[PDB]
Design an enzyme around this catalytic site. Structure first.
Site, PDB file in Angstrom:
ATOM      1  N   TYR A   1     -10.911   3.335   1.380  1.00 54.14           N
ATOM      2  CA  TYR A   1     -10.219   2.675   2.513  1.00 54.14           C
ATOM      3  C   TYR A   1     -10.951   1.627   3.410  1.00 54.14           C
ATOM      4  O   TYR A   1     -12.300   1.982   3.014  1.00 54.14           O
ATOM      5  CB  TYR A   1      -9.480   3.618   3.779  1.00 54.14           C
TER       6      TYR A   1
ATOM      7  N   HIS B   1       2.522   3.965  -3.240  1.00 56.13           N
ATOM      8  CA  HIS B   1       2.255   5.709  -2.938  1.00 56.13           C
ATOM      9  C   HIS B   1       3.768   6.375  -3.337  1.00 56.13           C
ATOM     10  O   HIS B   1       3.407   7.966  -4.218  1.00 56.13           O
ATOM     11  CB  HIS B   1       2.111   6.414  -1.538  1.00 56.13           C
ATOM     12  CG  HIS B   1       0.580   6.225  -0.823  1.00 56.13           C
ATOM     13  ND1 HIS B   1      -0.157   6.140  -1.548  1.00 56.13           N
ATOM     14  CD2 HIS B   1       0.256   6.089   0.352  1.00 56.13           C
ATOM     15  CE1 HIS B   1      -0.829   6.119  -0.899  1.00 56.13           C
ATOM     16  NE2 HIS B   1      -1.103   5.978  -0.013  1.00 56.13           N
TER      17      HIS B   1
ATOM     18  N   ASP C   1      -4.751   8.184  -1.540  1.00 47.36           N
ATOM     19  CA  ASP C   1      -6.148   7.418  -0.701  1.00 47.36           C
ATOM     20  C   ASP C   1      -7.274   7.674  -1.055  1.00 47.36           C
ATOM     21  O   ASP C   1      -7.811   8.673  -0.347  1.00 47.36           O
ATOM     22  CB  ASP C   1      -5.412   7.897   0.579  1.00 47.36           C
ATOM     23  CG  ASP C   1      -4.368   6.613   0.415  1.00 47.36           C
ATOM     24  OD1 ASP C   1      -3.968   5.602   0.925  1.00 47.36           O
ATOM     25  OD2 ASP C   1      -3.256   7.723   1.713  1.00 47.36           O
TER      26      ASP C   1
ATOM     27  N   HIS D   1       1.591  -1.250  -0.069  1.00 53.11           N
ATOM     28  CA  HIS D   1       0.406   0.067   0.255  1.00 53.11           C
ATOM     29  C   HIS D   1       1.086   1.007   0.073  1.00 53.11           C
ATOM     30  O   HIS D   1       0.976   2.137  -0.894  1.00 53.11           O
ATOM     31  CB  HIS D   1      -0.838   0.237   0.988  1.00 53.11           C
ATOM     32  CG  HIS D   1      -2.117   0.385   1.681  1.00 53.11           C
ATOM     33  ND1 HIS D   1      -3.139   0.850   1.179  1.00 53.11           N
ATOM     34  CD2 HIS D   1      -1.118   3.046   1.896  1.00 53.11           C
ATOM     35  CE1 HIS D   1      -3.757   2.916   2.208  1.00 53.11           C
ATOM     36  NE2 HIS D   1      -2.209   3.625   2.165  1.00 53.11           N
ATOM     37  N   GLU D   2       1.680   1.243   0.843  1.00 51.47           N
ATOM     38  CA  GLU D   2       2.330   2.646   1.015  1.00 51.47           C
ATOM     39  C   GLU D   2       3.438   2.892   0.160  1.00 51.47           C
ATOM     40  O   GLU D   2       3.895   3.555  -0.890  1.00 51.47           O
ATOM     41  CB  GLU D   2       3.296   2.382   2.086  1.00 51.47           C
ATOM     42  CG  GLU D   2       2.400   2.437   3.319  1.00 51.47           C
ATOM     43  CD  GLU D   2       1.356   3.229   3.670  1.00 51.47           C
ATOM     44  OE1 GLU D   2       1.683   4.866   3.530  1.00 51.47           O
ATOM     45  OE2 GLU D   2       0.197   3.252   4.721  1.00 51.47           O
TER      46      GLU D   2
HETATM   47 ZN    ZN Z   1      -1.997   5.732   2.212  1.00 52.09          ZN
END
Ligand code: ZN
Ligand code: MAN
Length: 167
Positions: free
Chosen positions: A133, A121, A130, A117-118
């Site tokens: 979520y 980014h 984002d 996920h990170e």
């Molecule tokens: Zn995020």
């Protein structure tokens, strides 16, 4: 390197990063061999179209080149509800928060999945945002707006986690 991390946190991160690397590798392979709609791809990235698939493929190709084990981890964040955060333009540094610790290594909303996920980014990896979520929200986004889904960090995590497992 690590910053403000305990011994437990360091080892959990090593295994998480190693599990993240494996997630991204298989997801990349999967994307290279599955060039048509499949339940796994559409659930997370919506209706199958080459252009979006290229984008998710590129994301994974770039993430695959990343060495998750060389990332710099920071465990000073104590926000109990947050898993982690990163600065899109400050590559290789992941700041971990409270929720990250109570999550399983692999599986759904896991530590390894959080890294995917990170990682997604980072502007170098594709710069996801984002938008939604959670699995519920991620699936909705994939059926409501595929373009956003392919640019959403969580949808990337869930495609990689693949749990419940789909083919
Ligand atoms: Zn995020
Ligand atoms: C995404 O759409 C496909 C149909 O093209 C299914 O395989 C999957 O279950 C998901 O709804």
């Amino acid at each position: 390197t690590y910053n403000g991390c305990s011994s437990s946190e360091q080892s959990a991160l090593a295994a998480a990063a190693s599990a993240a690397q494996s997630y991204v590798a298989e997801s990349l392979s999967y994307l290279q061999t599955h060039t048509a709609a499949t339940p796994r791809y559409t659930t997370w990235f919506g209706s199958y179209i080459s252009s979006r698939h290229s984008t998710v493929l590129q994301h994974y190709t770039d993430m695959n080149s990343n060495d998750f084990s060389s990332y710099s981890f920071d465990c000073t964040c104590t926000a109990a509800g947050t898993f982690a955060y990163v600065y899109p333009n400050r590559f290789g540094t992941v700041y971990l928060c409270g929720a990250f610790w109570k999550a399983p290594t692999t599986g759904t909303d896991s530590q390894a999945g959080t890294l995917v996920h990170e990682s997604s980014h980072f502007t170098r990896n594709g710069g996801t945002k984002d938008y939604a979520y959670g699995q519920a929200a991620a699936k909705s986004l994939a059926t409501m707006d595929p373009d956003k889904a392919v640019m959403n960090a969580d949808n990337h995590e869930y495609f990689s986690e693949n749990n419940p497992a789909q083919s």
